[PDB]
Amino acid sequence: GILYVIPAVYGVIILIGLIGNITLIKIFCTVKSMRNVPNLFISSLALGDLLLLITCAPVDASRYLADRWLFGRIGCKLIPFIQLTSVGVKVFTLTALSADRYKAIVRPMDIQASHALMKACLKAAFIWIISMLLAIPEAVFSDLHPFHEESTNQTFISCAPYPHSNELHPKIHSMASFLVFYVIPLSIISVYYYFIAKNLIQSAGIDCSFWNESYLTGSRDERKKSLLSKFGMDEGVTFMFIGRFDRGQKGVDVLLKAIEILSSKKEFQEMRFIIIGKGDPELEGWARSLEEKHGNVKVITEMLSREFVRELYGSVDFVIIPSYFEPFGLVALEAMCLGAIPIASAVGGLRDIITNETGILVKAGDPGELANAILKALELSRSDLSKFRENCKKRAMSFSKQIESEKRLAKTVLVFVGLFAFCWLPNHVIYLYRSYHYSEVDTSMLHFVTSICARLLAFTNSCVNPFALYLLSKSFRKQFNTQL
Numbered sequence: 001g002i003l004y005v006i007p008a009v010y011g012v013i014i015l016i017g018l019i020g021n022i023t024l025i026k027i028f029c030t031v032k033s034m035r036n037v038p039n040l041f042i043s044s045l046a047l048g049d050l051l052l053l054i055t056c057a058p059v060d061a062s063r064y065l066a067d068r069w070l071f072g073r074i075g076c077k078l079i080p081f082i083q084l085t086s087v088g089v090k091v092f093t094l095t096a097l098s099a100d101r102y103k104a105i106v107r108p109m110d111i112q113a114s115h116a117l118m119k120a121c122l123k124a125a126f127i128w129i130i131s132m133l134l135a136i137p138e139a140v141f142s143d144l145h146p147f148h149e150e151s152t153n154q155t156f157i158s159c160a161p162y163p164h165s166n167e168l169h170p171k172i173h174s175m176a177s178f179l180v181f182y183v184i185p186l187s188i189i190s191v192y193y194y195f196i197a198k199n200l201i202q203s204a205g206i207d208c209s210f211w212n213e214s215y216l217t218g219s220r221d222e223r224k225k226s227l228l229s230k231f232g233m234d235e236g237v238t239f240m241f242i243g244r245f246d247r248g249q250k251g252v253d254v255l256l257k258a259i260e261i262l263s264s265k266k267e268f269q270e271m272r273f274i275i276i277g278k279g280d281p282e283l284e285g286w287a288r289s290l291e292e293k294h295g296n297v298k299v300i301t302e303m304l305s306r307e308f309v310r311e312l313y314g315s316v317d318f319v320i321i322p323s324y325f326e327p328f329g330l331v332a333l334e335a336m337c338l339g340a341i342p343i344a345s346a347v348g349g350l351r352d353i354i355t356n357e358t359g360i361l362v363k364a365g366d367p368g369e370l371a372n373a374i375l376k377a378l379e380l381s382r383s384d385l386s387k388f389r390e391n392c393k394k395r396a397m398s399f400s401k402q403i404e405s406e407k408r409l410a411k412t413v414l415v416f417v418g419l420f421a422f423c424w425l426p427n428h429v430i431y432l433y434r435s436y437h438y439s440e441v442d443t444s445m446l447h448f449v450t451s452i453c454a455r456l457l458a459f460t461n462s463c464v465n466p467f468a469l470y471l472l473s474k475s476f477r478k479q480f481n482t483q484l
């Protein structure tokens with residue numbers, strides 16, 4: 001009676017997984033905008049999950065209804081093989097996705113993304129082949145053996161992969177399964193994400209929603225005059241430095257040399273310099289002395305809200321990044337997004353981000369060179385720079401979207417990993433123990449609880465990955481909605 005209620009829930013969840021994974025694979029094949037190396041691996045997963053759902057459904061349906069094997073040798077051997085193929089694709093492809101995230105963020109290459117999908121198809125293909133090759137033993141071991149139940153003194157056909165006479169081999173297979181399909185892959189994923197987490201950090205703060213002229217009020221020219229008037233300065237080309245006062249990395253020294261060089265000319269009076277940083281006291285004083293000697297220099301040695309640098313970036317005409325070493329270039333991307341034109345050293349990220357149409361590159365360590373660019377900007381400033389500013393905003397919002405989208409992908413892959421780790425550890429522990437204690441019959445209620453839950457947790461992982469994906473990606477959700 002209430003029994004005919006218990007399976008219906010199983011079918012509900014099985015259908016949700018089948019619909020979801022299928023819808024996911026269909027969207028990957030049908031939608032060009034979503035065709036990419038991460039999605040190809042995710043589809044690889046979705047394919048592996050359907051197989052598991054499909055193999056397990058008759059297995060589970062059968063255990064609930066009858067006590068005997070109803071599929072025959074072919075069933076007794078193909079099912080373990082297909083089941084185990086799934087388990088490698090699942091974990092190995094997750095490792096491949098983790099590697100993809102590492103390459104995309106830690107070591108962006110992509111000079112010729114032409115063969116990237118070509119390379120990805122092969123990696124997934126090989127993973128399917130290796131997963132099948134590792135699962136070939138499951139078919140050999142599993143065979144039909146007559147079984148006598150203590151509960152009913154009756155003999156039934158049984159699929160049994162466990163020999164009663166030989167004890168050494170189960171001990172070897174169990175340990176290998178834990179290491180090959182759990183410990184080694186998760187360990188590789190954790191190394192990868194260690195560095196991924198490392199680089200996610202340099203990147204923190206870059207959000208298009210925040211760094212935009214939408215929050216600022218009034219014209220840029222009007223905002224600049226207000227900033228200068230509060231500083232007791234008249235309107236002029238405004239150059240900005242926001243950085244720690246450190247000799248080795250940021251070029252506060254190079255800039256201060258440059259202002260010394262430019263202090264002699266009649267062009268200095270056309271310029272205004274705001275140096276916003278704190279650090280070495282001697283460097284801090286050189287800045288203060290220049291502020292006292294030159295009426296066109298403002299210095300700020302106090303900490304400030306990203307809100308107030310946002311306003312400054314919009315108000316200022318140019319931002320100087322004289323970094324002897326800048327790996328990411330966050331300051332330039334945030335500034336260019338608000339219209340500030342970067343005058344930076346051609347080092348690390350700055351070089352890739354700043355093109356000729358989007359700013360001025362100088363050689364680092366040359367104060368004279370920096371000064372000359374400052375003079376160039378001065379001349380450029382005479383003409384309209386509105387077009388350059390729009391180009392800047394656009395280049396920087398283009399990168400900030402990829403930076404943001406790839407950070408989301410890293411979190412989504414890690415979500416997937418987490419569910420897997422949690423849902424598959426119990427199955428591994430039960431499999432190992434059983435390997436040494438199969439000859440003994442365990443009827444303890446704890447054993448049934450330990451097993452009935454593991455099987456449902458693993459089955460849950462197969463259905464949740466699409467639904468999971470449905471909540472972490474705005475883009476996937478909209479296309480999934482369209483199909484339904």
Ligand SMILES: COc1ccc(C2(CNC(=O)[C@](C)(Cc3c[nH]c4ccccc34)NC(=O)Nc3ccc([N+](=O)[O-])cc3)CCCCC2)nc1
Pocket residue numbers: 056059076079080083084087138141142159160161162163169170171172173174177178181427428431435455458459
């Ligand atoms: C929910 O589906 C699961 C749940 C758990 C697993 C395990 C354990 N299940 C099995 O390994 C099955 C898939 C269990 C199984 C074996 N035959 C089956 C037929 C139909 C359904 C399931 C099975 N095969 C197996 O036990 N083979 C085996 C047993 C003993 C020895 N040995 O070391 O003597 C060597 C190999 C645990 C994680 C790592 C390996 C896969 N696999 C699939």
